[PDB]
Structure formats: structure tokens, C-alpha cells
Amino acid sequence: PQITLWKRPLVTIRIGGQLKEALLDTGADDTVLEEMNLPGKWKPKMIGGIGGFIKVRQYDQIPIEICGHKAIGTVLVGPTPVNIIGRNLLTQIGCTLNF
Amino acid sequence: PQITLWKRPLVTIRIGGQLKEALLDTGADDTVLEEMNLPGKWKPKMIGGIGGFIKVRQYDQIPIEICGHKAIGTVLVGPTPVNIIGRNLLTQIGCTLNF
């Protein structure tokens, strides 16, 4: 589909078979989800945004669907105010910017 | 153009006669540039992202040419880690997400 940018490009994602709303973010290197009690091993990571860095848990090879398109990759979990789909997953679903 | 996302979507912009590199950022409500001089009266404001809030200077009705496409809109200036073109200007240049 095509998504205009008049409002925040929020779309439905599925992780662990459950649904969330997330921002399709071309300014994000990584995918960062709001605190959730995801199972499995993880590694500590620090990621930086406009106001500084936060601590996240890095989970690898996690299946996700984004607007019905399947993807699999690294998902960071931490105290973000918004679920963010970053370029690591946007490439997998064939997402481009166009003007 | 059509821009894929295996790299950061940086483009050349012209603003106040000067050339800069900036990130086409669908996850940004606002356009935020690194500390610089711009003509006109600015209003103090605060914006937040991951890592928290920063203080910026809000300049209104500022022309920027973004990858050959003209826009005139609100530009925030402050200690952002990267020059960011947000949705306020992406809409002006007719930018959309597609997959």
C-alpha cells in the first residue's frame, strides 16, 4: 500500500501472535518496542535518540508481521513511549520512500 | 525519486544559502536541525524523543530545498544528534511510504 505522512504512520504489527500499533520510522536504524515480557535470551544494548540514550534488551531472530507482511530480525525492548519499526525490518517488507 | 532503506535516507538540503545533509524521517513530527544561525525571531520550545526532551529554537516559515523540492515551513534548531526532516516538510514535498 501507500501511506501518506499527514499523520503519524502507525500500522498494526504482530509479535508473538498478538497485535500492537507501531510507527513506520525511516529515521530509525533499529526496531524498538515498548516494554513487553518477551521470552528468550537477550543482550543488553544502549540506543540513542534525540534526548540521549536508553537501555534496551536485544532479542534476535524474532518473527514479526507488519501490516500483514512477514519479517524476522532483531527487536529491541525497552522504555520507549512508542513502538518503532526501524530500517532493519522496513527493508524486509520492501518499504520505500517516494516523492 | 524512490529511496530504499538499507542505508540511512540522507539527502542534501539547501537552507539559508547553505548546504547540509539531513535525514528523511517518517518517525519525526517536526523538522530539527543542528545548532545554526537562521534569520528571524525564534520561539523557545521543547521536543521529546527516545532519551527524553531537549530545548530548541522554533523558526517559522523557513524555505528549505530538499533534494530539489521546495518547502517553506517550521524548522526547529537545537542540539539534535542529526539533521532531521520531519513530516511537516515531508508532506510538502509529496513524500509517501510505499510497500
Ligand SMILES: COC(=O)N[C@H](C(=O)N[C@@H](Cc1ccccc1)[C@@H](O)CN(Cc1ccc(-c2ccccn2)cc1)NC(=O)[C@@H](NC(=O)OC)C(C)(C)C)C(C)(C)C
Ligand atoms: C512526537 O515526538 C517526535 O516526533 N519526536 C521525534 C523523534 O524523536 N522521533 C524518533 C521516534 C520517536 C517518536 C516519538 C517519541 C519517541 C521517539 C525517530 O523517528 C527519529 N530519531 C532520530 C534520531 C536518529 C539518530 C540519532 C543518533 C543517536 C546517536 C548517534 C547518532 N545518531 C538520534 C535521533 N531516531 C531515533 O531515535 C532512533 N535512533 C537511531 O536510529 O540512532 C542511530 C531510534 C528510534 C532507533 C532510537 C523528534 C524529536 C525527532 C521530532
